[PDB]
Homo-oligomer: A and B are copies of this chain.
Amino acid sequence: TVVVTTILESPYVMMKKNHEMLEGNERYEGYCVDLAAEIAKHCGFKYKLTIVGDGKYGARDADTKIWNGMVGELVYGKADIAIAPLTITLVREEVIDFSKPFMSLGISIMIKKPQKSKPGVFSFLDPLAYEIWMCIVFAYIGVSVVLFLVSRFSPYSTNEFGIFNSLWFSLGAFMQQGCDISPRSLSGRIVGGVWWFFTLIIISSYTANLAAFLTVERMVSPIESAEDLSKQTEIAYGTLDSGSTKEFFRRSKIAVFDKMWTYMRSAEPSVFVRTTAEGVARVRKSKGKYAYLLESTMNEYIEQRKPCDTMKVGGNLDSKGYGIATPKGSSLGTPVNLAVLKLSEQGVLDKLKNKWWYDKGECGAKDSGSKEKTSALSLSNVAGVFYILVGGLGLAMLVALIEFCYKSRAEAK
């Protein structure tokens, strides 16, 4: 009767563990297998599934114009019905008829799930912004100068506040340490009064936000909704060859899409890859270097199956449709055409969409909820404080030598 030309892709058609055990036509299962079984029995015919294992979705090729895989069986007439995740396009439509779309999808960007970032060397000063650390050092100099200028005028023979000691008094006040010298005037002690109140807020502010950083973790979304793709050029975009995602970016006319296809041709080495499962694996080996653009409902499934290290970003960048491919003027097409619309209008198809993607198990708020213990700080989190310390240790020894020069040139005294 009918010969089903299709490919197995999770979760459309899958290979059951009952391969050698269960014989017959129920050895392969999936969302596409039920909808093929629904479309055949409401029409009346019965299915002969066979998967040509070349793997190519297929487009009309360059310089030879050969339909590669499932389309090649469907064009040359060696199979009759094609229930498969196959895209309806213009060059696809002209050779052979199509049904109405299963669901609505788009070209979807797939990346590695963001992790804990590499802690920077100077990442300890993250709780306070750049303008505050400048205004702390600027006010450090300013309060020291005002304390210096105050202490000169007022004797009430030992004025212990030089400009060098006034820097030292305010520095020890900033670092919560005790200083031996104290101001001995009403005009001086007000400077010590407001500067001590300056430190008590800021040091508590640094402790508060650093507690806020370690308690609540917030990971960056590196590339968002394809305008951030257009500017960031450290990542390598990736798509599948012999398919619709190849030819649509070849058909780029939007300026943001024209930026892509220039880089998609001019790149190294992944101009294209050959399997979505290879593309899933290439993302998981990338660790942020590479992204693989693919079908949206394919992208949604891999994020729900639980290695959990993949993330769909933004939204769809196109609109495409999965329809039952049929020969041009099919023996079965118009009965399939109404019965595809019949399953949609009573929500059996959307129930099948609810069925297959939900039952596989989820990776959502369940692991983000209570699979965290907050880690101890590593050496990397506070590494630069050691470098400033030992860098201060070497710089102190350098000024020790320049002191020996100026002390010895007391010579000819």
Q: Which residues of A contact B (CB under 8 A)?
A: 90, 101, 104-106, 108, 124, 126-129, 131-132, 135, 139, 142-143, 146, 149-150, 153-156, 164, 168, 171-173, 175-182, 185-191, 193-221, 224-225, 227, 231-234, 251-255, 262, 266, 296, 314-316, 318-321, 341, 344-345, 347, 350-351, 353-354, 358-359, 361, 365-366, 368-379, 381-382, 385-386, 388-393, 395-397, 399-400, 403-404, 407-408
**Which residues from B are CB-within-8-Å of A200?**
175-176, 203
- Give CA–CA (A391, B129) in the complex, Å: 23
Assess A198 versus B385: contact at CB under 8 Å? Given A209-B214, A377-B209: yes
**Which residues from B are CB-within-8-Å of A366?**
231-234
> Is A155 within 8 A of B399, CB to CB?
no
Assess A178 versus B175: contact at CB under 8 Å? Given A155-B404, A214-B208: no
Quote the shortest CB–CB distance from A159 to chain B (angstroms): 12
Which residue of chain B has the shortest Cβ distance to A376 in the bound complex? Answer: B129
- Give CA–CA (A90, B150) in the complex, Å: 81
**Which residues from B are CB-within-8-Å of A393?**
142-143, 146, 190-191, 194
Which residue of chain B has the shortest Cβ distance to A321 in the bound complex? Answer: B319
Quote the shortest CB–CB distance from A227 to chain B (angstroms): 8
Partner of A216, one of B194, B215, B262, B266: B215
> Is A127 within 8 A of B202, CB to CB?
no
> Is B213 within 8 A of A400, CB to CB?
no
Supply 9 further A-B pairs (C-beta < 8 A) apart from A153-B400, A194-B388. A126-B376, A155-B407, A178-B179, A190-B393, A207-B208, A212-B217, A221-B373, A231-B366, A233-B361
Quote the shortest CB–CB distance from A367 to chain B (angstroms): 8
Q: Chain A: interface secondary structure?
A: helix
> Is B202 within 8 A of A210, CB to CB?
no
* Chain B CB within 10 Å, residue with most, of A314, A389, A396: A396
> Is A375 within 8 A of B232, CB to CB?
no
- Give CA–CA (A124, B205) in the complex, Å: 9
Partner of A215, one of B139, B212, B319, B368: B212
> Is A195 within 8 A of B407, CB to CB?
no
Assess A204 versus B199: contact at CB under 8 Å? Given A319-B106, A404-B153: no
A-B contact pairs, 26 of them (CB 8 A): A142-B393, A146-B393, A146-B397, A150-B397, A153-B400, A175-B200, A176-B176, A176-B200, A179-B182, A186-B403, A187-B396, A195-B389, A198-B389, A200-B203, A201-B382, A205-B381, A207-B208, A209-B377, A212-B374, A227-B368, A232-B366, A232-B370, A234-B371, A253-B353, A253-B354, A319-B319
Which residue of chain B has the shortest Cβ distance to A217 in the bound complex? Answer: B212
Assess A376 versus B231: contact at CB under 8 Å? Given A101-B319, A203-B200: no
- Give CA–CA (A41, B225) in the complex, Å: 36
> Is A392 within 8 A of B135, CB to CB?
no
Assess A396 versus B203: contact at CB under 8 Å? Given A127-B376, A316-B106: no
- Give CA–CA (A238, B195) in the complex, Å: 50
Partner of A399, one of B190, B220, B382, B396: B190
**Which residues from B are CB-within-8-Å of A131?**
378-379
- Give CA–CA (A410, B33) in the complex, Å: 91
> Is A345 within 8 A of B132, CB to CB?
no
**Which residues from B are CB-within-8-Å of A185?**
400, 403
> Is B204 within 8 A of A210, CB to CB?
yes
Assess A168 versus B190: contact at CB under 8 Å? Given A198-B388, A319-B321, A377-B128: no
